[PDB]
RNA sequence: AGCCAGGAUGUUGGCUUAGAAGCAGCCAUCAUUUAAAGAAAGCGUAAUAGCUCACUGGUCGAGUCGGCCUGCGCGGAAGA
């Protein structure tokens, strides 16, 4: 029902992850299962939205890398300090 | 009038209470009930 | 109905006519008679019962007196003398002071032939039990 | 007046304040007072601060406050040369650093919090925002 | 937003103090006629009050509201 749209990172490691929230993009990681952990890059403002609703920490969500389809279920959030933002997202297979 | 550099409180004190921006400082009309009267500023230099 | 023309309420109990201590200096003056607060006053009061406060209408176009025709007696005046206290809301809601019926005021509440709201008998009557709830009486509908 | 009621040493040296705050999300009510700024709050500022948020909300709900003043405060009076040994105990201060959630509340509307939450940011010398509760 | 309307009845509200008629403070915060109309919103008060609004009917006719991330600025800012 909540669709994500995320891309692999390309990269990773502080420089980088800082680079990707410096670009209104946040950090997030699919792990869970027999398959190997994929890091991935979300848009901030769409997904700030997504999470605001209570449904989003409960349901089944879906999230789109080359239009391939991962269920997984929300599973921990890092919050900035302070501002209404997000810095990463734990994510488990459902 | 009364001067204060905040209006939040002064701004509400009335119905009729406006705030506008005469020359460039905020004043606080009410031409009503003038005693509600304010200005965020004081002149130049 | 029309306008503004002379009408003021303040009396305490009509088995009196006139009384001093309530008002006295203030009950009449734009051409209303104090003295007169008589002829009128029992001019329907002693052809049924002496304690029931009706207060009512003035008119005055340019005149020297005034007539007015009574209504019915307030709801207020039926909760000492015909179900529970005088001392009104007493301690309004820290206890629930004394209690009334479903059969008291239903009644007497639907005697009024110039008074309240509603086509329904009932309407108008449950409206009745909100004013003996001013004073923090119980329910036993 | 929050104070330790007793210690392992008179007085601490005076360190420094650098890094980001722990105990982030409202933990304990429905609604935080949160820190935006670094620095130091004083006993008497955490009072200033809850007496008016609980003046605000008529003794209602229920109140948290999350930071404790544990760091001694020494101050030199006039007409003291320097040194000749450390100054005496005179405060106590919390170091806030940004992220602290510092008053919880809970019990009352959202509205009301934030009148109380508005109240106490008053008497605080740091930047505070207004926090609710999260799943998560 | 503006302007035309209404803002009625239990109820002059019982009752805490010397008035009280929402007319101060504490208690509750019920109820009817409806298009809505708060046992009130705050000016005012000898009691009325006589104001307006909260809320709704009309008129107009296409936008309007104020929170969030952020850029540059405004006021805060008086000395020989
Ligand atoms: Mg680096
Ligand atoms: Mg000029
Ligand atoms: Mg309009």
Redesign the pocket.
């Known amino acids: 029902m909540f669709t994500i749209n995320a891309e692999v990172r390309k990269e990773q490691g502080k420089g980088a992850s800082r680079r990707l929230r410096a670009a209104?993009k946040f950090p997030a990681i699919i792990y869970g299962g027999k398959e190997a952990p994929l890091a991935i890059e979300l848009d901030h403002d769409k997904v700030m939205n997504m999470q605001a609703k209570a449904e989003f920490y409960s349901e089944v969500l879906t999230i789109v890398v080359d239009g391939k389809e991962i269920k997984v279920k929300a599973q921990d959030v890092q919050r900035h300090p302070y501002?209404?933002?997000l810095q990463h997202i734990d994510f488990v297979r459902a | 009038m009364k001067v204060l550099?905040?209006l939040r409180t002064a701004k509400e004190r009335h119905?009729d209470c406006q705030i506008v921006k005469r020359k460039?400082?905020?004043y606080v009309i009410c031409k009503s009930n003038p005693r509600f009267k304010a200005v965020?500023?004081?002149?130049?230099? | 109905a029309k306008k503004?023309q002379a009408?003021?309420?303040?009396?305490?109990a009509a088995g009196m006519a006139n009384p001093s201590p309530?008002?006295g200096?203030?009950?009449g003056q734009q051409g209303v008679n104090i003295m007169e607060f008589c002829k009128a006053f029992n001019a329907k009061t002693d052809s049924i019962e002496k304690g029931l406060?009706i207060?009512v209408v003035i008119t005055v176009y340019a005149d020297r007196s005034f007539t007015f025709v009574t209504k019915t007696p307030?709801?207020?005046?039926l909760?000492?003398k015909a179900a529970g206290i005088?001392?009104?809301?007493?301690?309004?809601?820290?206890d629930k002071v004394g209690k009334i019926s479903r059969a008291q005021l239903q009644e007497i509440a639907q005697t009024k032939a110039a008074?309240?709201?509603?086509?329904?008998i009932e309407?108008?009557t449950?409206?009745?039990?909100?004013?003996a709830?001013?004073?923090?009486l119980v329910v036993e509908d | 007046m929050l104070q330790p009621k007793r210690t392992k040493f008179r007085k601490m040296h005076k360190g420094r304040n650098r890094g980001l705050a722990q105990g982030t999300d409202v933990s304990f009510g429905s609604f935080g007072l949160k820190a935006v700024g670094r620095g130091r709050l004083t006993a008497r500022q955490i009072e200033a601060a809850r007496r008016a948020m609980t003046r605000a909300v008529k003794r209602q709900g229920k109140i948290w406050i999350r930071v404790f003043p544990d760091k001694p405060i020494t101050e030199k009076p006039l007409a003291v040369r320097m040194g000749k040994g450390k100054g005496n105990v005179e405060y106590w201060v919390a170091l806030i650093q940004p992220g602290k959630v510092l008053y919880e509340m809970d019990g009352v509307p959202e509205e009301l919090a934030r009148e109380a939450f508005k109240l106490a940011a008053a008497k605080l010398p740091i930047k505070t925002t207004f926090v609710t509760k999260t799943v998560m």
């Open positions: 209104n501002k209404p933002k | 550099n905040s119905p460039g400082r905020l965020q500023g004081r002149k130049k230099k | 503004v009408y003021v309420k303040l009396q305490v309530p008002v200096p203030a009950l406060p207060p307030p709801a207020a005046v909760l000492k005088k001392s009104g809301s007493g301690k309004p809601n820290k008074d309240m709201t509603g086509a329904d309407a108008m449950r409206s009745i039990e909100g004013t709830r001013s004073m923090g």
